[PDB]
Design a protein around this nucleic acid. Structure first.
Lengths: 81, 89
RNA sequence: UGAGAGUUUGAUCCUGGCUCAGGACGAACGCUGGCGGCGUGCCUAAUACAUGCAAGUCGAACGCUUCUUGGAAAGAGGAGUGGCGGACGGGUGAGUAACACGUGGGUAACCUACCCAUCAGAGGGGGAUAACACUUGGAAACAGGUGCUAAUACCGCAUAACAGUUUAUGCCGCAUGGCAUAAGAGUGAAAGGCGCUUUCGGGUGUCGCUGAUGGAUGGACCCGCGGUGCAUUAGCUAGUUGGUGAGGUAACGGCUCACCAAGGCCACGAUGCAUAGCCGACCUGAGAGGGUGAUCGGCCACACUGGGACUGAGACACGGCCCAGACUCCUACGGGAGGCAGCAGUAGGGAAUCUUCGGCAAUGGACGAAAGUCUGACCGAGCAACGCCGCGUGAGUGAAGAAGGUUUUCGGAUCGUAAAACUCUGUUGUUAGAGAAGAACAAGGACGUUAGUAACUGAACGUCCCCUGACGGUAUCUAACCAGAAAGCCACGGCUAACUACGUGCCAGCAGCCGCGGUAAUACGUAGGUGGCAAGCGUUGUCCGGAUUUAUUGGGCGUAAAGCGAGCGCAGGCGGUUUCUUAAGUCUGAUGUGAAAGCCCCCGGCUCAACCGGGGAGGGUCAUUGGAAACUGGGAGACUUG
């Protein structure tokens, strides 16, 4: 059974909590952006660069590795700007 | 994380040892990449039987020769030749 | 390097089955003591696990607390945050007929801190919390509330796109596509740690941090070919087959969604059923080939059974978690605890399989500015005659056959110079010393060297001292004593060396096979005589041979076992002569690979010997590349015999 990785368990629990918060923040940022593009009205650039900031800061400040961020910016700039 | 190291070939009382060169993920007498040297564990002054050709070729790739390799190849000055022909290079 | 021997009949020749003489019991000796050299030891229940050990490290990232000495600080200790490792190392073969394995290959559809290379760099803050003090709920496990605090912990802002498209330019490739330059839209940090010069200094050497490109190490995807029994197992398939687009993926893709069609695989064996982990390799064969998959090494898969994810780059994780199921221990009965196919050790199963010893000295991991700490890896120790080395149990001399055995006509044979006795000895056994050799090379710390900084003042590089061996009174030697301590196995009717006396005398019981017995047994049983291995020798089981008894090498069907009752023909097998071409088969060269230890050969060391070391031949029915153009095969013509 357990010897000394219960600290690893609690570390992983805190990482679950904060990574869940950060990934939900990223996803809601991306959908908040994607609502406006099919809408066609104002606020098309502010939330655009906010989505790009969210993707990049969850790539580097957070983590995927590099490339889901890169594929999202490719499928994003090939769709919006 | 490549790493050159040693290898045993004992019997019951009288061992024989061999240097072996590998990657550190592997077990000791398990797999490796190629071969370097050996040495007699008995009859001091024993048989320093070294290749002394692949150590500097291998550290050009960059590895970490262990504790015994540094002393018994400083007896041949190879680690002295390592920081003598690489820190001077 | 290829040996045949019995057995069908009153006898003969064939054909033919059965049995034997050789070696390959990874583990049952009823005997016995030398094994002290080298190696092995749950193959049946992937059966259930008490007892301990088997993963921690960092104080130069950072706060708090217990001691030798009311202000003292070095060393020590306690907890926590935080960082890296617990995915390596060790076990097992339950599953798996498949790119799981072996071999050859592809990345213009791929990813990686852990070691170096290159360039860009590398600030100011916030706001909590653990710890900490007090209380609530607690049987406990563990929850909860208030307040305070640090960082290389956490959290937002500035700066560069070199990545990534898109554009123009040039260049090229096997379809996509790729390679260099110039330009249109957004993006980080630990800003930290030590030591020196410290006269404001603030420059620093190192250790760290982030981004972009490289090498190397590790993982993944696909492709041609090769290894199994059943046809008393002929149809199988729908995300199947393809296209369209989108999602998703390190990565391509029906991996997944929506639309359009009905495509796909099979007699060369699809699908189905049973058994099996695969390989390098082996105490079989003359060789072609049969048998086994242990060591030891490589790959794959599994963790009481089945699902599922999270942290972490790397796991769907063997001593990590969540849920469902089975089973076990407590509960103050509300609830909790657990998974030795890691090392010994335990109970059951079985014809059957071992010690609960020390240390990281040797080596290899893990962290670190350092000593250092852990290791049931590993080094080694204590068992089983479990198999193979290499040596032992005296030697030279010594009888008219000592005594005595068995046998005999009693006159002799053999036991048997083998005894008894003389002269020499100590590989060994006992005693005592030397030798604890060889087992070990050894961080760091002072003394002294390079391209640079203002300065080894400190830094990254030296010679010399210091220091430690669990089995260790270990090996080995020297010297003293005594032939003293050191001998066991199955048969003798033939195949296949070895005879007598007597008993039971259709019966007590021997049979590998022929075959004995039954009053005169070298066959039932005793007793002595002899024989062959040899501290190892009988029995039992299994595998190859002998087996030409599955015959390619290497057999034949008139009567012996064996030509369908006969015809007609789809597919299939094989094809008349010749000119030119081709080069698929075929022959030939060059190159890369076929792990290491394996077997053999050359060379060497352990007193030889096994064991170990150095060098090449073997394993391709392999991949690329170049010729050869006789025969077979593909293309164009010709001829008349079929």
């Amino acid at each position: 059974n357990i010897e000394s990785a219960i600290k690893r368990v609690r570390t992983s629990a805190n990482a679950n909590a904060k990574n869940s918060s950060q990934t939900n923040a990223m996803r809601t940022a991306i959908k908040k952006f994607e609502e406006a593009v099919a809408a066609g009205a104002d606020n098309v650039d502010a939330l655009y660069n906010e989505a790009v900031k969210a993707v990049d800061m969850a790539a580097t400040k957070g983590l995927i590795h590099k490339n889901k961020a890169n594929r999202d910016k490719i499928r994003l700039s090939k769709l919006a700007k | 994380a490549v790493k050159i190291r040693l290898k045993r070939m004992g019997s019951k009382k009288s061992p024989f040892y061999r240097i072996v060169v590998a990657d550190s993920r592997s077990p000791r007498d398990g797999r490796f990449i190629e071969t370097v040297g050996t040495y007699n564990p008995l009859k001091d002054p024993a048989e320093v039987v070294l290749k002394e050709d692949l150590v500097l070729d291998w550290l050009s790739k960059g590895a970490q020769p262990s504790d015994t390799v540094r002393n018994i190849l400083s007896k041949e000055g190879v680690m002295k030749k390592h920081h003598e022909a690489k820190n001077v290079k």
